[PDB]
Amino acid sequence: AYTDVPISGMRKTIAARLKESVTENPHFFVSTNLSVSKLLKLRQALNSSADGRYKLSVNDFLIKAMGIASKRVPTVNSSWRDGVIRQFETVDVSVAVATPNGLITPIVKGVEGKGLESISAAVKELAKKARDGKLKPEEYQGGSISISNMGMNPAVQSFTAIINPPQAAILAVGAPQKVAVPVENEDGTTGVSWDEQIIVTASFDHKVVDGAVGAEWIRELKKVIENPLELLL
Amino acid sequence: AYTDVPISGMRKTIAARLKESVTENPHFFVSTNLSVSKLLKLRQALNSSADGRYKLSVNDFLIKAMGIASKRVPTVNSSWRDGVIRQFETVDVSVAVATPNGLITPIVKGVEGKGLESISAAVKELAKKARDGKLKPEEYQGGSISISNMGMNPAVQSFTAIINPPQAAILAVGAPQKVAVPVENEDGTTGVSWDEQIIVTASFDHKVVDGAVGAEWIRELKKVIENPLELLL
Amino acid sequence: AYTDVPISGMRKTIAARLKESVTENPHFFVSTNLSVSKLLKLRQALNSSADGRYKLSVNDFLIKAMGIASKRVPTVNSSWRDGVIRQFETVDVSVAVATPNGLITPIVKGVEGKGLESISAAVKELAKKARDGKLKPEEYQGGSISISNMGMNPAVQSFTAIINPPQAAILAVGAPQKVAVPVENEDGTTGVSWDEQIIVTASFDHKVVDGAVGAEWIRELKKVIENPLELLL
Amino acid sequence: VSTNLSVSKLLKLRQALNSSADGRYKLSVNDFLIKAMGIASKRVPTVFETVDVSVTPIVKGVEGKGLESISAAVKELAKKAISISNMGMNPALAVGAPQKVAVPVENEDGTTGVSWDEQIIVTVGAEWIRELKKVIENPLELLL
Amino acid sequence: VSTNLSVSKLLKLRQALNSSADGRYKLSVNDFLIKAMGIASKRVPTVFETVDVSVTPIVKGVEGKGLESISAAVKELAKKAISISNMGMNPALAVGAPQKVAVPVENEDGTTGVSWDEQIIVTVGAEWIRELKKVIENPLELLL
Amino acid sequence: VSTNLSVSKLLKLRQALNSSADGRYKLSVNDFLIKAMGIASKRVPTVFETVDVSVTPIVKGVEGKGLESISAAVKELAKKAISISNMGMNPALAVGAPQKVAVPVENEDGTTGVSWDEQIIVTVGAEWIRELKKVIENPLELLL
Amino acid sequence: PPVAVVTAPISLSAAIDVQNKLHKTIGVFLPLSTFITRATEIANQKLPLPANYQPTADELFNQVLGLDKVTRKESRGSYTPTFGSFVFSLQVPKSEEKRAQAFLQKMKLVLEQEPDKLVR
Amino acid sequence: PPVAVVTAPISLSAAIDVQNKLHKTIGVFLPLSTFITRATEIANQKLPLPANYQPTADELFNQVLGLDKVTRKESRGSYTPTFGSFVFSLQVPKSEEKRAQAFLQKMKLVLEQEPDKLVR
Amino acid sequence: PPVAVVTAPISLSAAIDVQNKLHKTIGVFLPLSTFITRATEIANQKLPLPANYQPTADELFNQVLGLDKVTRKESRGSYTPTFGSFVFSLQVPKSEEKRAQAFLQKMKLVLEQEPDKLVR
């Protein structure tokens, strides 16, 4: 006793692509933990001084920080062509939107020279059009880096993702959690404080990137996130 | 100075299979942390009201919860054939038994409609026959999901496993550990409590499953484990 | 707008090798956490009773412990040839040195029958010659196990590495961090103590090694590290 | 044959599992008794290898089933409309209405006190009643 | 048109970002004003789609830029040597020198007290001043 | 040539490593002295490049070896049956029996007190004794 | 959310006597306030529960098991009275109104026959 | 597991005197019990160790290293006496029997010449 | 690193009076030392800050935001005086020299008009 359903035409188009990525790009992973208390405080401060114009989220902050870190270390903002390496100077980020019909890949352009409001508005307009199924092809064709977030589900601590064919890196974000940290109380002792953290995983190709480059990339991202004011410069 | 030993006939039968799985199934991982204090209390409560009929273990609880989660999300209880997808309605689980001659793959059937006692008795009868080397071939041929446990060794925190050829998922269980958590003391402050946790890793194929489906699967498993009474319905 | 740079001659020599390793060696990972407070105390005790002869580091301790663990479990100190398995009796370890021109692979010989001073002196002489670009070919050709460390960067918690072609295992070391642990205070209660830990990842091939063997290997390494005096025998 | 069952613990279990839901279901005493009947029948087979219960609609496969599935069947088939009969809806196998009785409790001080227990009266046979009864007073055994 | 701006918070922000560096850079009030000028210049376009500022060297693309890049340009071009003019270097768009003024503070006890604020005087137009002013008193809005 | 060695720390080290075992082995003073002899010989080679010790059975490769391997060899070869001789078994290179002597301790209060140390008496040569002696009083140096 | 108040008179003569006497034999002088707080601390120790109390998951689970087969009928609290004498008043919702009363009478008893108790 | 007992007489007159006197000058009245427990607390502070004490791994490690070259000869405890007077008795195994005695005499001394000490 | 000292006289008659009197009415006798430490504890509670104080990252971040818009002008400390009478002296660097003085006068006031305060 069982049932069989014919394979969809669109399911092979992604199956072949996924099968090509693994056999074409060696993978190596890097993990880190980020404290995001200050970022939450800043978001709360900036989401109450408004009258209804906008509303922000963590993903926009991560996107902007990802742009800055890309700028500081440009070797990740590259691509592997037939017989030559391609190096860019503009950062385009690919965001993943899930729908019952499948997974789409909206794009955001000019992140380096942009603010949070425009990024949010673009990400939401594109998410709406992706859900409503009137997306032009040029709008989801190519980027430099890809991001995935699963913070809506508290049961996902950390996970991995596959790199897209022409790209050389991808980032995966988990859900927040709480951990104990040591605090030097002014009385001259050590006490327990409760910090909130997220675990970030990055997958890199080893033909265009090396371990040290990825480690430096993670360091710049961390420095930009833990200190949020540095998002200005 | 060195030594050489001829390769065994049975060592190539598994080498070829392992080499075929990696090049045939793209892999992506998901991780989570489960609290198992209540489960231990329930096991202690149910292992003392008996007179010698049975004796339970964590693996049986995980197997049953794995069956329930499979039932709620059936897309993981599937398989990829030549040109059509296969969807089942009965949950068969593959358990791994290690012996000096190699690794076997006993099977348990009808888990959805079963109790802990029968599961334990089957797993132990089959483990004995696997150790004694009188196992029929039909008894280790096919399932839907595979499980591996390494809680007997305290030095294994987390690890990965390879998916079997016809299956589309596998679960790996680690050893328990202790962590600090925050408790809201009735006096109106925050204190430190010591919870015991395990880290569970799940490996999925990306042709039959997507990220959201795996995340939901992990959520159902977690909900069933942390609240153990829900094993009844 | 973009730029293109011709691919280097040395870049393909490593690209082809990396691409051959993934399609030739199935990979499975194992992770563990090690407490290194006692090791730091011992290092401090042994780096102050000297007059300038030497100066030690954690990597030497890990190398020696890795040799002992290899000796106890010899199945990892092996190799896969055309049609026969190769089993050694001497432990040679490959250390990774990063330079702007690329990544090198110095070698240390006779680790089992050696002390910390000689290991440090060899690792530093070879690191200097690798940086100065006068390394003979025989000096970086073959070993049994490979090690990688990234403790100089605090932003790297855990990461993965690729196995070399003729070898069957590799170890990756992260950066230290601080965690809370329970202590049974003599008054008859439970308190919070702050331990320092590192997370160690090991990648193994599944044609020469099995899960249980790797788990035992990790256990021997852990036992040797947490108790440092056992480095004598 | 007649017996008395104490069902205080079972009510507490029902309240625990009816509060961790969001509106999905709601259980009752009849569902628990149906599942226990299969187990009691299973241990003493003299009263086939499949257990079918008549509430006269029919429910199948109680042995390999949970409370969720059993509850849905009992209510769907009712709307369209071994044997069990219940009359617990009127406070004034056959199942009666609950009541309260006094029982002795061994106080830690070393004397005997009064506590208020809740009971119901239910009407080879002795062994069947014993196995059924064991499952009710101790409710956790419904899993195995 | 004339207005008064309070710049106490802005100084604190500058001190925060000039201490987390190792020698890489050092910021000043003029850089902040240039970026804010682009903001209010965009909100009210009547005063093109690209914003160019003359300090008479030129700075380009202030809208899509950060403080680091703007600072480096303003200093490199100075060495080789809309419009802005500053005269804050002598304590005795046009920008003046800072000064201190008394303002009322609502003490929690329920009365009015004196606090010392730092001010500078800066010389469709009203809307432009309002948008610029909003960015200065509230400095966090320089991000969006 | 004669010298006196204090072996209190060495005994404590032996007790530490003989309690973290489950029955695998058990060490003694003779094993430690053999390993130290190689090191002392290594620094002063006038007393070959391989060190062989005669206990007249033979032990090989002490330099590239640990306590576990050395102990097993010394006991296996005994059953089948430079030079070392030991007579510590009777309380009444040549090694004698242990004894206790008084030594001065600088008490933190600022005076001199009596403490009880344990000693043994052992019978280019001066340098050899010094290097051997350094290894015994400070036992941690047996690693390098 | 309906709310209700509860009130009870008080006499502070005994506390005055203890304070005066202590001042004459040692030198210690302390305010009435510490007497008020210390009485409030000893009071919020054993107070009944509302009849419409709903338990939590852990409580029911532990009962369903058998670890705490004996249930509880007491629970601490955090009250703060309102000043006044010849009266002590409190404002609380209807559900707890009854519990808030056990507090007033407990303090009303301790402060009238056991002032000495609140000394070291 | 052989067991043995140790005993010592006691005189409680001084504690009675302190209680009575305190009751006459302030009003505070407290039971003998708190004197007994407070004496027990000050006693279990400095008690020798059994001669057959075996150390643990951490202790031997630091010793071998050089952080606590100076060893310890004291260790706290948790004893509870048995009631009685004209006597205080304790039951303990043979190994600690001697340590349990240092406890009896320490309390026997404090409770006879320093009753005042156990006041605030 | 230049250093400077600050000094202030003292009179300990009142503490003597309190000790003697307490000894005659109850029996408690305690040394001057506890008076010295207890005065030192109540003193190091509210002391101004050096005029050349540099803040930290968290402080500036919180101000820039708006959580602690009201700044602080007080900070605790850990001082230990030097013995002497007819004087109390302290040695500290120049920057804090002024803060160390607020400490001397605060103790100089409490120990002269409020000895009773340091009793239970």
Residue numbers in the entry:
A (entry chain G), B (entry chain A), C (entry chain B): 226 to 458
D (entry chain L), E (entry chain H), F (entry chain K): 255 to 301, 313 to 320, 330 to 355, 370 to 380, 396 to 426, 438 to 458
G (entry chain J), H (entry chain F), I (entry chain M): 264 to 349, 392 to 425
Excerpt from the publication:
The 2-oxoacid dehydrogenase complexes are a class of protein complexes with acyl-transferase activity in metabolism and amino acid synthesis. They co-localize 3 catalytic components (E1-3) that act in sequence upon a substrate-carrying lipoyl domain(LD) that is flexibly linked to E2. Like mammals, fungi also utilize E3BP to recruit E321,23–25.
To determine the interactions of the fungal E3BP:E2 subcomplex, their CBD and CTD respectively were recombinantly co-expressed and examined by cryo-EM. Tetrahedral symmetry was used for the preliminary reconstruction, and 3-fold symmetric sub-complexes were computationally isolated by symmetry expansion and signal subtraction. The final reconstruction to 3.2 Å utilized less than one CBD-trimer per well-aligned PDC core particle, and permits the CBD from N.crassa E3BP to be built de novo. The core fold of the N.crassa CBD consists of four helices and two flanking beta-strands, inherited from an ancestral CTD. The CBD trimer interface has evolved from the dimeric interface that core CTD trimers form to extend to larger assemblies. The present reconstruction shows unambiguously that M2 is the major binding interface of the E2 core. A conserved Phe (N.crassa F324) appears crucial for binding, as predicted in C.thermophilum. Additionally, K266 from both participating CTD monomers interact with M2 residues N325 and Q326 from the CBD.
